[PDB]
Amino acid sequence: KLFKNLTFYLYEFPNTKVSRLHKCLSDNGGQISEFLSSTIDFVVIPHYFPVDELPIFSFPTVNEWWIERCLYYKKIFGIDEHALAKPFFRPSLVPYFNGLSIHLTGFKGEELSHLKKALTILGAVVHEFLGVQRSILLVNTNEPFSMKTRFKIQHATEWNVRVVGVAWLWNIIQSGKFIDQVSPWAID
């Protein structure tokens, strides 16, 4: 099993989610304790839980998306391998993302799904399609540009949609502070 010999501690999850999350971990060889002890391998936080409201944990802390990532690629990642697998949500970022219409390009699978949800709770509106009236075209620069991505960039340039490298967003997530200037991450 994937989560063999691993004990998890679920923190402040709603009752409905707990049972579902319990079954997912249990069916993968993982155990769950409601106590903090040396047995605990990982502390799991809901992805929408405000970082600032989190208590101090003497254990590696991840969100439930870390579990989903582990199952998607069928292996155990480090806690710092992906910014969305850790607690990241800060309510102070919400007024900054508010009103921003964002379309994503170059992202696939679980990363795309998690990114949409991340941007949504942060106060932004994620659009399934590129339109003339998009605030931002967010480009995945960690992958070679597909033909479709290159098309969207050209259209965004013509339609005066801001073309921004994803590093800009990762920097906001990791630092916890919004960045008004996107020019250092523009593709142009």
Ligand SMILES: [Cl-]
């Ligand atoms: Cl749309």
